[PDB]
Amino acid sequence: MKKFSVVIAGGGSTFTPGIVLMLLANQDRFPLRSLKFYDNDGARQETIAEACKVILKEQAPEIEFSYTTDPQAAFTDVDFVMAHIRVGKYPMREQDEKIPLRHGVLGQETCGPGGIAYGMRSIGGVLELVDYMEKYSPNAWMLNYSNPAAIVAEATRRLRPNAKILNICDMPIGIEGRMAQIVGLKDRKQMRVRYYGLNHFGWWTSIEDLDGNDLMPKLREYVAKYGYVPPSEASWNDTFAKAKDVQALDPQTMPNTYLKYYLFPDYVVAHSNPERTRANEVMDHREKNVFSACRAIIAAGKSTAGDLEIDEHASYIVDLATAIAFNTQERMLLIVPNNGAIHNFDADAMVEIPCLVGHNGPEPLTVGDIPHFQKGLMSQQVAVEKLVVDAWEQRSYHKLWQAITLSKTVPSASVAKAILDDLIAANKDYWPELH
Ligand SMILES: NC(=O)c1ccc[n+]([C@@H]2O[C@H](COP(=O)([O-])OP(=O)(O)OC[C@H]3O[C@@H](n4cnc5c(N)ncnc54)[C@H](O)[C@@H]3O)[C@@H](O)[C@H]2O)c1
Ligand SMILES: [Mn+2]
């Protein structure tokens, strides 16, 4: 078995330790000779890196390890780039969430004007990583599990069409995990599914066990009463529960949880608090906890000084990496150019659909024609995403106003323009200039 060189772009991330623990738990299927951290925030990364340094010397001292702010040192001699950056960090996520809310619109990490703003910040950053990877490790694959993938994937499709980038999302993985528990299967890998949509905007059409038995009837009966809350944090519980109402709009399918923001934006605004948003919760909890536990590890010189555990969820990252590395043909939902897969939908749209993954990347499976309801929703939203990338590319104020105006989350062109002017003011150091 061969060994792999990985570089984590976003070393300063609070998820880095959990992901590293995950990788160490998967040395049997994905052996590593080298692990590197890269970040543009040195001081923030140093705390994470020095703590991970202790963990690595305990569990796997044969893995060569280093951290840096230098692209050349980071991207040289790697097989994979795991990109989980958050341009602007939590202070900007806080703005994304509160600015729309002062105008009576939902503020969310990847949906609505908040997500649009995060997408406008993220495009530039990701194009940089892609360029670094191609310059120092031309044969490397980038596993981009950063958000907001619908906007960033549309940018890379347009500007780096041939780059070896794999766009993947964990939301479907988490939902499938809950589905598996609801029907009573061991795990999600005991299911074979069909699905279509945009990232954070899709539907399961077929859900079966490996033998082909239909699991849909049981899921319908259950989700119709409790949503994706299986028989086994407050904000997420509500999202998973609200899927009850979202699934009700099309009883034949199962929906992606992000559809609640588009079908019930009123509900979201009503149950929000413009003083304390999700960013505030993470900042005062997960952010402070991980950095604290990391300084505790460095100061004590022992991992047990911290309470960092394996990030089980993140496992799907290794599934993707092994699929590429060992040409496994594993079936998974990836974000790829449509080009006929959804026959009655724009060829140049980025869609989240089943693909077989091998050494050449994905081989997407056809989907067929989709119904008017989903087609209408996706046509509206994909127009939003394409106008955002248009605004970015052409440095156009007017394209971004169009984009925000088109969103199902935005009540009118006048409110859209007010939100836009506030987002511009708040993102002065991250967005290109708009004329
Ligand atoms: N398993 C996971 O890591 C996971 C889970 C859910 C969502 N996400 C998504 O991944 C992204 C990262 O979120 P997170 O919570 O893991 O990270 P985080 O918010 O805990 O930290 C982000 C890190 O990325 C760094 N960064 C920002 N811009 C950069 C650039 N241009 N170059 C290099 N580094 C940069 C920041 O300095 C910071 O250290 C988000 O979009 C999030 O929605 C990741
Ligand atoms: Mn996602």
Residue numbers in the entry: 1 to 232, 238 to 440
Copy text from the publication.
Here, we report the deposition of 14 structures of enzymes from both the core and accessory genomes of sequence type 23 (ST23) K1 hypervirulent K. pneumoniae. Targets were selected using a shotgun approach aimed at uncharacterized metabolic proteins from ST23 K1 hypervirulent K. pneumoniae. Thus, the x-ray crystal structures presented here provide the basis for functional analysis of 12 uncharacterized proteins associated with high-risk K. pneumoniae infection.
Of these targets, 34 were successfully purified from large-scale preparations and entered crystallization trials. Fourteen structures were determined for 13 different targets as detailed in Fig. 1.
